[PDB]
Design a protein around this ligand. Structure first.
Ligand SMILES: O=C(O)C(=O)/C=C/C=C/O
Ligand SMILES: O=C(O)C(=O)/C=C/C=C/O
Ligand SMILES: O=C(O)C(=O)/C=C/C=C/O
Ligand SMILES: O=C(O)C(=O)/C=C/C=C/O
Ligand code: NA
Ligand code: NA
Ligand code: NA
Ligand code: NA
Lengths: 483, 483, 483, 483
């Protein structure tokens, strides 16, 4: 019923609190204490000091063991974490159990393992006097990492940033989304119980503008800011940290495409586009909101998708056979519904959905919408260019390989793309021409945590994952010995 | 007498021009045509288009071979490049012959080779269905790289950015310092004569605010901005590209320290600090302006360094035995002299220098100052904390190793540091505790081009050099094949 | 014409000599002096002393520049090298001009570049006393490398070993095949004229047993033995160096398969198999001598291949549209023909060829055979299991993917395989299951010099190419500093 | 007690057994069943078959998880492993507790982690038709690994080979020293209880010639032979596998030097050399048996070492304050004593030791010798050049740096060297000149498991540890896709 901040080893309240609302039924889950500027400073100062403490003296093997203990602590409370994620967001219990929570445990274990095996470089060189010199690099913590995370995959994305930060020996001040504060608070309890030293991990609650989020980005004591969320928010943050020339790592919006070629396994493609459009009710940065299907199979694709989409069970997270929960909030539902209207006004054909389901129970006070498919829009329509972040896709026919490549690339975004084809040459030839961070062939959101992850253009800045995270969360320093 | 812009394969003039003045004698060298917003736009569009032309079709081996040809063409005009860099900046001819021009040639060769040898990653994974998946990464050009370079090592820093940009298959719009435009204009001729396709390399002349530099940073058509220069300028550029979320790479100011331990080779450390403080008349980001010397050798060090500083020949670039030329400009001299006055005001002892030499010839119309040594200032003094960028160092005693490490690190900058000690443990123990991008032990500015190069805190953002350059100037894309 | 040994900077003759015979017409090309044991010792001692000369003092940059001069020297005498390869082996002039000689040049250039860019490792560790330690590795020359090469790709395979050896700072004693000693002798001239210091590169001529090859392998002065050739010879050499526990690197025989799946591009597959079976008259270790074609397209494949094999031009190296020259020698032809008879005895159907062409000119005194195709042999037949090393292939149908994988792997060899398929999944799924060093999909013998190259089982020992050559030809040494 | 073989998941007896003798007192510990040729074959065939079973189907994550369970199993029986190691070897309990057993556990954990994190390479290339090609590598099990280990660090060295072998997906047939079979037998129990599939790990007991060791090396079913032990045995083994061209990896003898410069911390160097000479009663391949001390400190060094050596407590493994236990066996003691006499015969001064201690108890029936120090021998003396493998060192003075470097390098061996100096330049300058696999500066036998580990010359063949192990125990295969 109440969620506290976690600062310098202590759970602490605040002068103000805000409502945490279950989107299944509009009911109050808890009140959340909002950290103010003083508390943010206190968090950052504590993190700075923690760097000079026992955390700073741990060997890499011991730090890694301790991180493995955080992962163990989450596993030990697995079902509590599931319930926490579910309550905040309305996501299906099965998704929380298979995707959200196990990925958070894996995030810690993977970066603990990387931290342990990573090494640096030795460069030998000749000099004028014939004695030579040695250059070697070492890996130091960057310092205090400020973490700001979104609500689509709360624990997953939170720990995606927090785990490599800690693995590289940094200290952390982390601000989860106001819409999904619960699993982050549980994680803070796991950290405390695991004996993570005071000040190493700090959790602050609040909003962005004129709240904890902004105060973090403005604090001169942080060394870097890592952020996942809206593109325009990324621009704001970059401006905020600019005077301290802080390092930044961004994963921002997309308007991602799926492309189905005539030679695709059609049933697999229909199935694939279904999950890529409607997973988490379409509320993943990685979702496909534009779909291009070859003309010769377009009608059969749209027909098959319509059928599968209409079979999707929209209901309670714990309901048998449920496929979709609600949107995160009423405010977000208002945005999505305003796009549903905008699509009609723009001339779209509503193949399916386009409204909100009727339950005749508590769920009518929730924030549900229906899975929606449009056709008939131009490539320039706002509904096909702007990110909606709802369970929706527009499907469009295409004819030629180069044509569709140009159409996928005709965007200010470039996060990810999914391609369906059985042809060897086409798969590799087309993939390399798509201007995004991630291309999937005959699948979607399939993740190896070692790979580079991120987007080009407005979709991001930098890369994370594997060695790219080890690079960002570390200060690589060069030492030259004249011999 | 005239320096043109180079846009889309053609040398073009402009409506306005500005003076290029020789700092040795205050005389006019050339008129430089200033690119306006329209010309900057034309350069960017031409760069965008060149990406889809012949340049985009070259194999990695053919691109590398052409970049080697650029290097060859500089080499074939070696003495012209020397005379250009000298005329603009007043640097001694011997420095231009040994440092500036050869490093510019070596920059191209190094990144050409790196481009031929670099590869990417293959990740194998298991899937639920037991068929598995492949993730592989590919290296693509990022796009159009905006380059803005400073006047301290004009061609070296210009090519430091341009070489890896081209080696990675990018196209370039580059704006060199208004104080040192000549060698860059010469490079454009080499580019043209070598057969670099139109639009691949574009040179725009001008200033920062309300001029070519600002127009470049604000153009939506660039994919990245790499910049070396003032720290506050870095902040301005970060703000300016934030709306487009552009990749940025910064090498900024420094207030670098040298530390001389009791067990140093004293005569070598004196000579070392002389070189680190007064090379290029102290106008390098890497120069030492703070010097800490063990108490037991402090008086001897200061006396030794005074004698050597007064031996330095300050004069014409090709004068016999010359060690120091003038500062870059009268405006920069006004800044430096302003700090010379501030130091006396803050209670400094002037061990030597402190003013301007009197030549009683045309050099009196140039921008010379004396090499200057201060003692007696507090660690809080402005002259000890703010980057001056002239031929000066303050020398302070220390007693204790941990004390001196704290005093070195007590700075909003962290670019480089030089340490003098003959003790094995001390060299490695102390070095790793210095919070800077580069440490030298028993030398200074010894460069291996494969090392990471950059600074921490206000001194930089990101790293370049070796694979760090190959990452920044590349778009690293992940492709996932479900099998 | 005469071919001398090259020892300690000098061309020298020997007590004994043998004939170099043109396989096109059986005429004498030159006399070759056979090095005795005394001269082999002299070469090895010279190479040992060369490690302590000026060669050992060169910077990696300077050594790389010199290697680039060797490559320049071959390029400057390109057609002389083409002429020499062709004379010894009868290979088409077009193959020599496009494959053989350019690869030899690219071998030197690639490893010189690799030597310039390559670095080693830095490992930090904690210690009980809390002060830590550093482990760093350095790359040293291994010492004297013994090189023994075969006659199939004479200069290519010779420089494939010699180039990385020199690039890693080693010295070399090299014994080319008695059947192809010309191009290597010319290479010795290039080395001498490029100013390669005396003893760095030594060339000895002769045979295996009781001759230069054996003497080299028995000499205690070498640090490693690298070898390409027959599998049994590999075993003999391994025994010979065992008393000195010398490092060895072997690329040995193969009985390589090609697999054509039903979804293949049939015309391309036919042309591909033609190439992989008959290139260099089937005298490449990488050639396919067993072919598996899906039952549904088997007859059509065999018909198509027969027609193409019959259009092949067998004749003079510079003859218009020539596809195949002779075999290396009459003795080799004796072996290949004996297998032609054996195949008939084992009950093979001779689809085409199976004899020797009748020229009615000087070529009838050469060592030509016809390109040959067989069907109807069981998987256990000697001709399907033993390496023939001539222009021949057996074709057999298959039904099942798992079945054909098993049949390809049912072999004591494991060098290479080519598979033909347009299916994305199939290419990757099948390729990873083939127990060979190298798989090609929809091509054959397409080389990127950075990749690992070698065979499993009886087909080799170790890998070369890229970092694997850099590792084999270097002493990687670990240095640990306790801090 | 009895020690059985472990073949295809079953503990089995043999036709013959041999005695396992406690070297502290000469009493019988157990009878050990000696595997015959038939049982060796059964073990190899079972290892082959296990590759095609459930073991072959584990994901890299699952295989790693299971290898961690093996480590967990050892940890759970920690004191039993200690007792087994101690009983077989007479090693001090505190050594087994801190070095031997924890390293066996760490071997498994380190390679499990490396297997989880390791990835391979992607190479892009251009082709004539302008479509390009992809080369990528994959990591496969080599096959069946034959492991032969020595008695000096039984479980440590046994798991040093077995852990990476299993981590890379191989199956194992492993033969421990007849002198120390107990801990390896306990390990098979741990494997069994952890649910390692039958045939994945096989333990065969026995001798070398005409026994399990020989039979394993000559078996055509193994893919590789990894071996630590005597040099001459390495030669024997290299010959035995030659007919199969098996991959081999050797860590062989040494005659290692320590060098103490005048500027060393003398006290630390005396303690360091005491540890390097007498650890495990001088029975480690890495022990120093030759010591060079600068003449200015020679007498003080030798006097101090004499004092510390005489303070060494030689006795029972669980004796209070024990430093040294017995040698491994009476047979080994006879060898070491023959060297003690030989030293006297070539004119040595015995500074201390030189015989066997008189205990007047059951230990007199064991295999004890005294820690021994010689001076007065020339560099050509057999006792200064041949590996003794007992608790002994000769100390010689030196004058010049280049002199002592030549004397260290004047050896058919080159495993390791330790150097004592406080001078920064000297440390790096001298270290890189010692022709061995491992140099320690101001320490000895400090191990980072990521570093390359092995010797040059007669001391080894190949490298293990880190990526070097990952390379040797893996088949790295290239796949080339033409696009
Ligand atoms: O899977 C990840 O590591 C990740 O960061 C996903 C981002 C999705 C945001 O909506
Ligand atoms: O040496 C370099 O590569 C470099 O970038 C030097 C920067 C110095 C700025 O004053
Ligand atoms: O292409 C290569 O580098 C190579 O080694 C070719 C081997 C062919 C042997 O017949
Ligand atoms: O510490 C190791 O990994 C190792 O292999 C030690 C070898 C010592 C043999 O006597
Ligand atoms: Na909520
Ligand atoms: Na100027
Ligand atoms: Na010949
Ligand atoms: Na025993």
């Amino acid at each position: 019923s109440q969620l506290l901040n976690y600062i310098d080893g202590n759970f602490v309240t605040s002068a103000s609190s805000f409502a945490n609302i279950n989107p299944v039924n509009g009911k109050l889950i808890s009140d959340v204490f909002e950290a103010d500027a003083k508390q943010v400073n206190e968090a950052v100062v504590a993190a700075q000091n923690a760097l000079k403490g026992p955390w700073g003296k741990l060997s890499v093997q011991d730090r890694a063991a301790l991180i493995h203990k955080i992962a163990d602590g989450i596993q030990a409370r697995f079902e509590e974490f599931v319930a926490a994620e579910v309550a905040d967001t309305g996501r299906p219990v099965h998704q929380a159990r298979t995707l959200d929570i196990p990925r958070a445990i894996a995030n810690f274990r993977t970066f603990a393992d990387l931290a342990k095996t990573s090494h640096t470089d030795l460069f030998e060189m000749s000099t004028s006097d014939g004695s030579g010199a040695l250059n070697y690099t070492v890996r130091k913590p960057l310092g205090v990492i400020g973490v700001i995370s979104p609500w689509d995959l709360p624990l997953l994305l939170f720990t995606w940033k927090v785990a490599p930060a800690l693995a590289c020996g940094n200290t952390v001040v982390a601000k989860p989304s106001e819409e999904s504060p619960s699993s982050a608070t549980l994680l803070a309890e796991v950290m405390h119980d695991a004996g993570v030293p005071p000040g190493v991990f700090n959790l602050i609650h609040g909003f962005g503008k004129d709240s904890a989020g902004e105060f973090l980005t403005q604090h001169p004591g942080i060394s870097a800011l890592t952020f996942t969320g809206e593109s325009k928010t990324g621009s704001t943050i970059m401006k905020a940290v600019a005077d301290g020339v802080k390092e930044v790592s961004f994963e921002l919006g997309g308007k991602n495409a799926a492309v189905v070629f005539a030679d695709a396994d059609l049933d697999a493609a229909i199935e694939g586009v279904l999950r890529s459009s409607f997973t988490n009710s379409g509320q993943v940065c990685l979702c496909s909101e534009r779909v291009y299907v070859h003309r010769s199979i377009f009608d059969e694709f749209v027909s098959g998708l319509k059928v599968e989409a209409e079979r999707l069970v929209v209901g309670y997270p714990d309901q048998d056979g449920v496929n979709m929960g609600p949107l995160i909030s009423h405010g977000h539902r208002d945005k999505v519904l305003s796009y549903y209207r905008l699509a009609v006004d723009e001339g779209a054909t509503v193949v399916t959905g386009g409204g909100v389901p009727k339950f005749n129970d508590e769920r009518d006070q929730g924030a549900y919408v229906q899975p929606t498919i449009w056709t008939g829009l131009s490539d320039k329509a706002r509904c096909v260019t702007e990110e909606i972040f709802g369970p929706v896709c527009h499907i469009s026919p295409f004819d030629d390989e180069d044509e569709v490549i140009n159409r996928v690339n005709d965007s200010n975004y470039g996060l990810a793309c999914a391609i369906w084809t059985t042809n060897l040459s086409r798969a590799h030839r087309v993939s390399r021409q798509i201007h995004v961070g991630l291309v999937w062939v005959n699948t979607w959101y399939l993740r190896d945590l070692r790979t580079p992850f991120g987007g080009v253009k407005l979709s991001g800045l930098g890369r994370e994952g594997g060695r790219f995270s080890m690079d960002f969360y570390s200060d690589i320093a060069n030492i030259c010995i004249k011999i």
